[PDB]
């Protein structure tokens, strides 16, 4: 009845409310290991201390020094947890490259994946489709939860569209003239090292919701051409399918991480008071419009490298990832994220193929960043 | 994989929608058999035409002789249709007390019930679901057919709440010295119309949504909702809300009925979320609007005492149509009714046992607008 659970990536915002929710919840769940990078070191030793958990892992080489009492340590050592830890739940919440190896290792291992690292979907692609079996990836981000709840409404064949939600972000309702020159401070992007303000420009630029249309394609093998994006500022619904007959199910609650965690975590079991319902006593209203295509073309170039397959989308995020941080460093102009990307993809024939190994994946991200940074350079 | 479908009421709104459906689905679907009351005699006529079914109920005597070509004609002529033919599915939108007992006669054949008749299990109440087996009711209205989707996201530990939408009628935001000069004519009257406006439809369907789906009166609850595109929704243990959403139109939900559990390709129109919408919450004012309260109180009472509830709605309705009661007097009276109503939570054993219940409602609630 109890599940095993292996939290990696522990120290982030998504580990610390898995950790939150398995301790209100130890009939249904037990912590029996924990992962994060060195640089994190601190918080994961109060966390050890906490949990009692002693299974424990520095994801990389690095607080060298300071590991003489941890279990595994080193390259790849969140690895080599997942590989030698029994448990029911392996929780994926490894920001960017670390989350890759350990993904394919859970699955390996036969475990569920709670899926949080984007990475894993995004640049592994096949790679993790071919080692993982039906059901056994449940992801953790609010969108794709929502869409995992509606999809209960009806057997595969009669879904007709996956239609995942979007706030906008903060240029909603912007023309390209109005985008031409704002500022990466405009975006809502300040300094921090951490993916935080990547993270606020891709919301701005629709890179993230790119990268989504691209992680529910794999994650439900839909089409990209069933998978539409629509814009909803309240955020209250979190996606919604719609099926062959006409009916959409739709998946709404306020906003809160440890809802679409909890399931991840429990699936397919729901956890009792994981998080707050809407209250329907209170006026409201969900307002829906749709997506700008023309003035936010990232999308369509996300289904564009999804179709094109392969090391395509590793191709499409590694080449986000380095013309953002040009925008961030004020570099480039707002346009030129979205414009250098599909530049870099019009060149990146050769990386179509799938991935025959974690080495071409690799591969394929350090290429579009040398052809991004490239196209950053002049400009 | 042809159910074989009767309709019953084949000559209304629903039942029309219905063949419309089936003709659409002749894969799916085979009509083999309609009722309906002789009113629309042209209608029946037209449909036996098209459809080709020759085994036809009609409820009037005087209609069927017009024919004289009719297998079943009188009182319980669509009952006897049921029990004589071989169906998968029995659609009943039969109208008020005239659905009772086919849907007692198809409930004892085995067939699935697509149940568009709400007296059947409102007023009926155990007398139905003693007749019925597990799954064997599948609604037909737009709410309970949501609640059945959404109910589709978890187990049934896992429901905290169940949420019927009401459109909130035409009287939305009216005060009762508002509603004191309401004309038949305002409140669209029509009988479900009238009730829609007084908010005794939501109050049946949360009478009709616990005896479905065996959920306690406290955990239903009714949200305003006037673009009804959400149509229903369930609120799970966890936090989470899963709802049922489309364009109104009843053809969604009769072919998920008829096809249960199977959807069916093409039945509705989608939502097209490529142009801007919105969807508005609000809660229901009970002070002005307690009719839902009172379906409460009355479904916690059980026994005969819903089945008091929409007789006395009928008689106090057709009062306020007759120009002798004021709009809310016909809750008023429904309250009025029902608190005199003490010796009528007992468990009805037979037909009679209701229809004993509704006499003494209807004259009760005459007995008030006497009075008024
Ligand atoms: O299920 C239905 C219905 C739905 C669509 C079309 C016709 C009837 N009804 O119960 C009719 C009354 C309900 C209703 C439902 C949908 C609409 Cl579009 C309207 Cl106007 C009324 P209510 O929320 O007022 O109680
Ligand atoms: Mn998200
Ligand atoms: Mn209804």
């Given at each position: 009845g109890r599940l095993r659970v292996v939290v990696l990536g522990s120290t982030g915002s998504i580990g610390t409310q898995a950790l939150q929710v398995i301790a209100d919840n130890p009939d249904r769940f037990e912590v029996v290991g924990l992962a994060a990078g060195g640089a994190h070191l601190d918080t994961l030793l109060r966390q050890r201390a906490q949990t009692?958990?002693?299974?424990?892992?520095?994801?990389?080489?690095?607080?060298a020094q300071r590991?003489?009492?941890?279990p595994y340590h080193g390259s790849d050592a969140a690895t080599r947890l997942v590989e030698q830890t029994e448990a029911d739940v392996v929780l994926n919440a490894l920001?960017?490259?670390?989350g890759l190896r350990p993904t394919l290792a859970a699955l390996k291992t036969g475990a569920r994946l709670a899926l949080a690292?984007?990475?894993?979907?995004?640049?592994?692609g096949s790679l993790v489709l071919r080692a993982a079996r039906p059901g056994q990836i449940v992801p953790v981000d609010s969108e794709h939860s929502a869409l995992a709840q509606c999809?209960?409404?009806?057997?595969?064949?009669?879904?007709?569209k996956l239609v995942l939600t979007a706030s906008?972000?903060?240029?909603?309702?912007?023309s390209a003239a109005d985008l031409e020159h704002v500022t990466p401070e405009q975006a809502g992007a300040h300094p921090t090292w951490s993916m935080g303000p990547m993270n606020t420009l891709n919301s701005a630029s629709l890179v993230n919701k790119g990268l989504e249309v691209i992680e529910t394609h794999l994650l439900f093998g839909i089409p990209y051409d069933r998978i539409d994006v629509v814009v909803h500022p309240?955020?209250?619904?979190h996606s919604m399918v719609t099926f062959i007959d006409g009916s959409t199910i739709a998946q709404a609650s306020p906003p809160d991480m440890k809802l679409p965690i909890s399931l991840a975590l429990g699936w397919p079991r729901r956890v009792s008071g994981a998080a707050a319902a809407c209250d329907f006593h209170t006026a409201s209203s969900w307002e829906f419009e749709p997506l700008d295509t023309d003035v936010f073309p990232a999308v369509e170039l996300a289904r564009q490298a999804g179709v094109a397959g392969g090391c395509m989308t590793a191709v499409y995020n590694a080449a986000n990832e380095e013309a953002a941080a040009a925008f961030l460093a004020g570099?480039?102009?707002?346009?030129?994220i979205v414009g250098i990307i599909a530049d870099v993809l019009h060149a990146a024939?050769?990386?179509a193929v799938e991935p025959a190994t974690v080495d071409d994946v690799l591969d394929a991200q350090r290429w579009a960043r040398e052809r991004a940074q490239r196209a950053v350079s002049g400009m």
């Open positions: 009692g958990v002693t299974n424990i892992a520095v994801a990389d080489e690095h607080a590991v003489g009492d941890i920001v960017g490259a670390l690292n984007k990475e894993s979907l995004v640049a592994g999809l209960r409404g009806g057997t595969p064949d009669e879904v007709a906008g972000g903060p240029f909603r309702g912007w309240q955020s209250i619904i570099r480039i102009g707002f346009p030129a024939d050769q990386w």
